[PDB]
C-alpha cells in the first residue's frame, strides 16, 4: 500500500533475483560437467575402436 | 461597537490564539513521532540488509 512497503518488497525481489543468478550459473556448470564426462568417455571408446 | 465590546472580542481572540498554540505543538509532536517510527523501521531494514 505505502511506498516504503513496496520498497521493501522490491528489495526482497532483487534478493530472489540474485539467488536465481547463482542457481543458473551452478546449473549450467553441472550440465556442462556431465556433458564433458559423457563426451570424454565417448571419445575414449571411439579412439580405442578407430585406430586399432 | 463600544470599547467594552471590542475588549471582550479581543479576549476571545486571544483565547483562540492560545488554543492554536497548543494544537500546533501537538501536530508537530504527532508528525515527528510518525516520522521517527517510519525512519527507525527503515534504519532497521537497512542495517539488516547492509551488514549481512
DSSP B11: H
Contacts of A4 in chain B (CB under 8 A): 38, 41-42
In whole angstroms, give the CA distance from residue A36 to residue A41.
8
Q: How far is B26 from chain A (nearest CA, A)?
A: 24
Written as nine digits, the cell of A30 is 553441472
Written as nine digits, the cell of A36 is 564433458
B39 near A CB under 8 A: no
In whole angstroms, give the CA distance from residue A39 to residue A27.
18
Compute how many other C-beta atoms are within 10 angstroms of the C-beta atom of residue A26: 10
Q: What separation in angstroms does the CA of A24 have from each of A17, A27, A28, A33, B4?
A: 10, 5, 6, 14, 87
In whole angstroms, give the CA distance from residue B24 to residue B32.
12
Helix, strand, coil percent content, chain B, rounded in steps of 5 = 90, 0, 10
Amino acid at each position: 500500500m505505502s511506498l516504503l512497503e513496496v520498497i521493501i518488497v522490491l528489495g526482497i525481489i532483487g534478493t530472489i533475483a540474485a539467488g536465481v543468478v547463482i542457481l543458473a550459473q551452478r546449473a549450467f556448470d553441472s550440465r556442462t560437467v556431465s556433458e564433458l564426462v559423457t563426451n570424454t568417455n565417448t571419445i575414449r571408446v571411439a579412439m580405442k575402436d578407430a585406430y586399432q
